[PDB]
């Protein structure tokens, strides 16, 4: 259940495909909670490829549904990322996550 609310500007045509490594200025937010992760702090903007199940399922399906320059707003369900387990100390079990995602990439 990946729900998209895109802040408009970008190109809307450069869609992510397989074998493509892309760059995201993501920002983690817990729903009704504080931050937990920010690529903008470390300023190394998280180069990663598509398809090898590196990222969670909610971020992976939200990645391909974007384009270059766009700014989305993810809402990840618990069953796709951690909701049975929860990442220990950082993500509680049965959690719903909020992501500010901007795709500024190559390939």
């Amino acid at each position: 259940g990946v729900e998209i609310e895109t802040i408009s500007p970008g190109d809307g045509r450069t869609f992510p495909k397989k074998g493509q490594t892309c760059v995201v200025h993501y920002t983690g937010m817990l729903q009704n909670g504080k931050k937990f992760d920010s690529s903008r702090d470390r300023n190394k903007p998280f180069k990663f490829r598509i398809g090898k199940q590196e990222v969670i399922k909610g971020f992976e399906e939200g990645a391909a549904q974007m384009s270059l320059g766009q700014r989305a707003k993810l809402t990840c369900t618990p069953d796709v990322a951690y909701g049975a387990t929860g990442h220990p100390g950082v993500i509680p079990p049965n959690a719903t996550l909020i992501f500010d995602v901007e795709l500024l990439n190559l390939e």
Side-chain angles (χ1 to χ4, degrees):
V2 178
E3 294 181 355
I4 305 298
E5 292 179 352
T6 302
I7 292 96
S8 72
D11 59 356
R13 63 182 183 271
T14 306
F15 288 163
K17 292 181 181 180
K18 292 181 181 179
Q20 293 180 356
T21 299
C22 59
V23 175
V24 169
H25 293 280
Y26 68 97
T27 298
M29 181 65 74
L30 183 61
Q31 183 183 3
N32 298 114
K34 65 182 290 294
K35 290 175 68 176
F36 62 95
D37 195 358
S38 176
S39 64
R40 300 292 293 162
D41 292 334
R42 293 187 296 273
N43 300 114
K44 182 178 183 292
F46 187 67
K47 295 183 180 180
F48 72 104
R49 66 181 295 166
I50 300 298
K52 299 295 182 289
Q53 296 180 357
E54 297 175 352
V55 301
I56 60 171
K57 293 181 181 180
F59 183 75
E60 186 177 3
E61 294 179 354
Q65 294 176 357
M66 292 176 68
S67 180
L68 177 58
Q70 293 180 355
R71 184 176 180 178
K73 182 178 184 292
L74 293 176
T75 304
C76 293
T77 62
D79 57 356
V80 301
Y82 292 99
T85 300
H87 184 74
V90 180
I91 300 301
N94 194 4
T96 304
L97 282 316
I98 304 300
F99 292 102
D100 192 3
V101 172
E102 181 176 0
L103 182 64
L104 296 175
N105 58 355
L106 296 176
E107 293 178 353

